[PDB]
């Protein structure tokens, strides 16, 4: 077993606008002794499944405005919390978190739930990882909703997907500094800074998973993996580019949080060009990195775009 701890359930007692019932998978292949939490909303026998993947330092709570919109369209919605996050178990050592640790978890979850007709919904690490899934099992994937995200390839193959790491100083550089440096990391305060439109109660929901620093190893490791990409990550991410460019023929919808200093237009337009058939992006002027906080619009517009060419 990996050494891991579990957030007490009382931490989730008073969440704001998260009425979604918990589902758990324990002992997924390759993850013995670890319990993963996921939401499973809407018609369980739906033809379509929206697989909503979160990023750093969030959890399925981030999708709370989108889930009801997708479910009311008649689709199923699966929103897992990565190990280290949300209501999932949390390995205590940063060394146990790797790109493939997280990627293989998603593949295991997809196989375990036998998800098909997937609309992949991604942002940040949900995208860095999620965008590498379809090439592993392409017949399971039907559509893509992409918000502020890209692929963790090397600087030479796609400079746009590395330049943001070092400029602007107040972008990823500040984000990483905020996450990896404090001994007492307060994610409510972090999230209010990086999503300034959050209410206090919403911000508290992002601190909920983390009673203390011992629960935050996954949180600390994510930004380090953006700055230092292992060979497996580079290879897998580069292969993914070829998939979206050359193999993908599904329906696609893009939305950009225009105030994002990390993964805004300078990353998302290059990403648009690499995704075969990706339409003009929906630009959300007021949205920052956490586009899902303006997510009702994204979900509604994506559904209309998809209805238009079913």
Swiss-Prot record:
Domain of life, source organism: Bacteria
Any Pfam family matching the protein: Abhydrolase_1
Keywords tagged on the record: Detoxification, Hydrolase
First-tier enzyme category under EC: hydrolase
Gene Ontology MF terms in the entry: epoxide hydrolase activity; haloalkane dehalogenase activity
Keyword Magnesium on entry: no
Enzymatic reactions: 1-haloalkane + H2O = a halide anion + a primary alcohol + H(+); 1,2-dichloroethane + H2O = 2-chloroethanol + chloride + H(+)
Temperature dependence: Optimum temperature is 37 degrees Celsius.
One of the protein's GO biological processes: response to toxic substance
EC number: 3.8.1.5
Residue ranges of domain AB hydrolase-1 in the record: 49-295
Binding annotation for chloride: 125, 175
Pathway: Xenobiotic degradation; 1,2-dichloroethane degradation; glycolate from 1,2-dichloroethane: step 1/4
Entry annotation: catalytic residues: 124 (nucleophile), 260 (proton donor), 289 (proton acceptor)
Reported function: Catalyzes hydrolytic cleavage of carbon-halogen bonds in halogenated aliphatic compounds, leading to the formation of the corresponding primary alcohols, halide ions and protons. Has a broad substrate specificity, which includes terminally mono- and di- chlorinated and brominated alkanes (up to C4 only). The highest activity was found with 1,2-dichloroethane, 1,3-dichloropropane, and 1,2-dibromoethane.
Entries under NCBIfam families matching the protein: PRK00870.1 (NF002043)
PANTHER family: AB HYDROLASE-1 DOMAIN-CONTAINING PROTEIN (PTHR42977:SF3), HYDROLASE-RELATED (PTHR42977)
Family as reported in the entry's similarity comment: Belongs to the haloalkane dehalogenase family. Type 1 subfamily.
Subunit composition and interactions: Monomer.
Stated name of the protein: Haloalkane dehalogenase
